[PDB]
Amino acid sequence: GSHMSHDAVRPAPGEPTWVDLLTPDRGAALQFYSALFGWEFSTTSDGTSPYTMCRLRGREVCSIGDLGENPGPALGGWSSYLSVDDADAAAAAVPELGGAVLLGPIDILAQGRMLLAGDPSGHRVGLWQAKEHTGSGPDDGIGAYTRSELLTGASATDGAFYRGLFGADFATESGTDGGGRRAAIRQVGPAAPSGWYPCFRAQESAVPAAVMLGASVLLRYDCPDGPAVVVSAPGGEVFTLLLTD
């Protein structure tokens, strides 16, 4: 052990951190995404590696692993994780805002604590408490992260939730226009999908490509930053495609 330099990204709360994707069929997943955008993968010297590191033009994208048997009715797939000032406190805010803390705040190997909330169906939604220095550095191209949205049939209420995390209640109440470079609450109905779905830049030609692979659309809406469409991948996880030329 010894002390050395370090570089952490996203010092203040509100900025994106990372997202993990759990799918039952890793082998198929790779193919799927590969045909959407063509994200590269990391090469391991050893035999069968535990997980695959998905990279694009030398830019860490994400990691995809297997699920197993009997996943559950509603997982969420892409588990959004945003840094906060005081997760411990958010736990108390959860109920106060009209939610339910599923798991946490719990310490994991004295490295970090995370928070979970949502419905008992298995919706994984919360925030991660950054303590130590973490590395990051996304890119600004087709395929890179864009933003995150909350597909719910009660935005009126969901809004209150975020409001208490980092809205007017707090000082870090960033956000003028109707969502740009931060997470926002979206309103839907019963026929439409539900759950946190991140946004991924793609081409018009990728839209149909996905279908061919065995995916289906749920809802199609417009947005100021571009057209956004919700697509349910065969794995179970749902993702949002945003066309950008």
Dist. CA 62–CA 59, nearest whole Å: 9
Dist. CA 233–CA 195, nearest whole Å: 14
210: tokens are 């996905």
Count Cβ atoms below 10 Å from residue 164 Cβ, excluding itself. Answer: 18
Domains, the chain: 16-243 (3.10.180.10)
139: tokens are 């890119």
Q: Which residues are annotated as a binding site?
A: 237
Q: Which residues are annotated as a binding site for Zn(2+)?
A: 237
48 to each of 39, 51, 56, 63, how far by Cα in Å?
A: 20, 9, 21, 15
Q: Are 139 and 56 in contact (CB under 8 A)?
A: yes
Q: Are 72 and 195 in contact (CB under 8 A)?
A: no
Residue 24 falls in which region: left (phi positive, over 0), alpha (psi -120 to 50) or beta: alpha
What's the longest Cα–Cα distance across the chain? 56
Q: Are 177 and 147 in contact (CB under 8 A)?
A: no
3 state DSSP class of 160: helix
